[PDB]
Design a protein around this ligand. Structure first.
Ligand SMILES: Nc1nc2c(ncn2[C@@H]2O[C@H](COP(=O)(O)OP(=O)(O)NP(=O)(O)O)[C@@H](O)[C@H]2O)c(=O)[nH]1
Ligand SMILES: Nc1nc2c(ncn2[C@@H]2O[C@H](COP(=O)(O)OP(=O)(O)NP(=O)(O)O)[C@@H](O)[C@H]2O)c(=O)[nH]1
Ligand SMILES: [Mg+2]
Ligand SMILES: [Mg+2]
Lengths: 183, 13, 184, 13
């Protein structure tokens, strides 16, 4: 049925849209009403990964994606766990309409490098809620600069309408599939 | 997936 | 994770005491107020594991890192068809000694386990919880024991409130897994 | 731990 079970973890302040980003990705659905995640949760999706071919060459592997959702209010608490060190890649979100959630991205990355299976784990940075342009407060150049300083991909996404959700997740999938041994 | 603090088993690694 | 990282899943109808049992085990604490579990949750515990022979000869302790997963009873059988569920190494199956229907539903639970776990015969320990409520007890001990014998699984009557048999039941499940696994 | 539906990697199996 599947060739690889791949586990990713979404992170970021409460309210930035972690639950909604996973839900729009796996089910194509979105709920307006905020219900904070307690404990932890997950979703799964079977996808097909076609590799980045050199010179342009095909070889599509069945991936079983397992997408873990964290409680933003628990903050930095379950970083201590063997569970966390089993996460293969990180989808790090902030809220394009919340400067404070963006200002907290530096410490999230620091916390990530300190507790993951690697001091340089794969991270994809998402500026979520791009559909609320009238309430935007984070300037694209600042977000792009921050991603460039750390060397991680940056996407502006919307869990409401799906814009760039799959692109961001497939980018994380690609990093892991190229870093993993025997592939 | 081999890391400096831990190695993740991929159902390679 | 030092010698081994072992993962268990606790199951049963809503209200039987899954969250309270795992919390009593990891923290020795209990709360009377019912806060039903939404989604999933887990607690981790470092414990020492001491193998026992058939004669009772005890080997040296091994450091186990236990990862104990807690499930929502209201989503009864929601997605036993996930890769998450197929990664549970063993199951702590609970019912409530004060709720006969939760006990009558144990057969269906075992059926659903065997159809959806990593194996057709996964390790199971049956707990009859809330043994501290003697006046409210309704499940007949002889019938719980008969049922356990039929499926060949250990049975413990536990209390999340006062802690009785909680370590024993989890330790027996750990013993089944350690005995069963392949090592390098 | 080897099963008819899935092999669980234990950090043996
Ligand atoms: N317009 C819009 N609203 C969004 C978007 N993503 C999330 N929201 C809304 O913002 C709120 C928070 O979403 P949610 O996914 O619960 O955030 P979270 O990161 O999971 N928070 P927590 O960590 O507390 O569980 C909800 O009201 C949700 O509908 C988005 O892309 N666009
Ligand atoms: N006296 C007593 N009360 C218990 C015991 N175990 C649980 N309870 C109580 O019974 C209720 C249910 O406990 P809880 O652990 O939430 O059950 P659950 O199986 O996790 N329910 P859910 O599936 O809805 O999350 C709570 O009010 C709790 O205080 C026990 O051994 N003794
Ligand atoms: Mg959430
Ligand atoms: Mg509960």
């Amino acid at each position: 049925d599947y060739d690889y079970l791949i586990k990713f973890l979404a992170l970021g302040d409460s309210g930035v849209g972690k639950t909604s980003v996973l839900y729009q990705y796996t089910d194509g659905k979105f709920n307006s009403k905020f219900i904070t995640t307690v404990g932890i949760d997950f979703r799964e999706k079977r996808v097909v990964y076609r590799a980045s071919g050199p010179d342009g060459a095909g070889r599509g592997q069945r991936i079983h994606l397992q997408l873990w959702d964290t409680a933003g209010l628990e903050r930095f608490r379950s970083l201590t766990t063997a569970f966390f060190r089993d996460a293969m890649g990180f989808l790090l979100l902030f809220d394009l309409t919340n400067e404070q959630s963006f200002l907290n991205v530096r410490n999230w990355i620091s916390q990530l490098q300190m507790h993951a299976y690697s001091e340089n784990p794969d991270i994809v940075l998402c500026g979520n809620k791009s559909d609320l342009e009238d309430q935007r407060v984070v300037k694209e150049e600042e977000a792009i600069a921050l991603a460039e300083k750390y060397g991680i991909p940056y996407f502006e996404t919307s869990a409401a309408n799906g814009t760039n959700i799959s692109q961001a997740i497939e980018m994380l999938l690609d990093l892991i599939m190229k870093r993993m041994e025997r592939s | 997936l081999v890391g400096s603090r831990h190695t993740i088993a991929i159902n390679x690694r």
